Amino acid sequence: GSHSMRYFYTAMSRPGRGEPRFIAVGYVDDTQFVRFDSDAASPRTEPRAPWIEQEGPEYWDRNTQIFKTNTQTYRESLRNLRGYYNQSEAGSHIIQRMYGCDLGPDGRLLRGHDQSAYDGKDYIALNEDLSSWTAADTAAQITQRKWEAARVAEQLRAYLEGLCVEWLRRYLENGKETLQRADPPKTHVTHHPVSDHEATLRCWALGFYPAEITLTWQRDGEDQTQDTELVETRPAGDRTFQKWAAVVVPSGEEQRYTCHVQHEGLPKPLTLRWEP
């Protein structure tokens, strides 16, 4: 299948409560495999998936050096952004960054990403060309000018087309029994009367991986987008995800409704109905 690697950085200031926290987590698809937290008793890069544990000390040391360096750099960046927005020293602020690479089903680079946000709003992003920037405002234009001056984009491109893909492929091989295994959803439809003449049909998908899934209800073969209550896909805590979609239907009309499930783990898409 297609696969991706992402690192997610959160740098958060907290005036009066010490220096800004820096936390980095790394993912392959929906599987976290590393963390680094500057607030840890002894901050170091820690494994969070069994298949990464085989990496040698050089790997962990390299990672930790990078994250420790970032802990410092991102603090300066937070100071800089505070100034770019003429903000007071009183408030907490957050830089977030997500970056990494996407592979297609042939294992080839589909595209790279490097995106940053400030206080939850898009700040600056590397364009798909891996060569130019999109800055959200005149503050981010200052960063852009700095990054253009320092040829940051060229270094991200080198990483994204090189190390990023190389390591992702390595992880996919090392963790192939899980990372390259799609677990299809276990499905059932439940029925709950909400009144004498309406009932809830809830279509459940449990135990699936990866998280991407499509769960819809149709009535007489027509999508019921507006009338469907769809919960956010949620982690079970055992690597798998859960989701449900519910419709309230007129009593007696239950068989006009079909739940449709699309998941990578499904060679054939499911059509389910309530089975009384």
Binding site: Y7, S116, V152
Partner: peptide, 11 residues
């Protein structure tokens, strides 16, 4: 594996 930044990677 993450990307190595420099000091000029500051925002």
């Amino acid at each position: 594996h993450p990307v190595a930044e420099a000091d000029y990677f500051e925002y």
